[PDB]
Amino acid sequence: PKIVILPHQDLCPDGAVLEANSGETILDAALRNGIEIEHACEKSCACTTCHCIVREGFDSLPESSEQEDDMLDKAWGLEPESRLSCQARVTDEDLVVEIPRYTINHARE
Numbered sequence: 001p002k003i004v005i006l007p008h009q010d011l012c013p014d015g016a017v018l019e020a021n022s023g024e025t026i027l028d029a030a031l032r033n034g035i036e037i038e039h040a041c042e043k044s045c046a047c048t049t050c051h052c053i054v055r056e057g058f059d060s061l062p063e064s065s066e067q068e069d070d071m072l073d074k075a076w077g078l079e080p081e082s083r084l085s086c087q088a089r090v091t092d093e094d095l096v097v098e099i100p101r102y103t104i105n106h107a108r109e
């Protein structure tokens with residue numbers, strides 16, 4: 001399915017259209033296309049730097065785990081449609097995704 005990344009001043013100025021594979025995470029699809037979404041804990045579901053908001057298609061994605069939910073409670077700019085992009089896997093529906101203006105990372109320099 002197609003994943004549209006909304007325009008992001010720092011990581012995707014004009015936005016982008018990604019052709020993602022079913023079962024593939026939003027993050028891996030983004031990274032293959034050179035969209036550098038931060039992933040501090042290396043896709044271990046232990047941070048919130050890969051946080052994204054699924055504006056369209058949130059219901060198509062597999063429900064978030066208990067471990068993911070706990071991490072999201074720490075996410076800056078949390079919304080009902082927030083997901084850790086390293087955990088959210090595309091299924092059979094096109095998505096519209098927004099990368100947050102900021103993400104909390106106590107280890108950032």
Ligand code: FES
Nearest residue numbers: 039045047050086
């Ligand atoms: S990269 Fe750390 S939770 Fe996704």
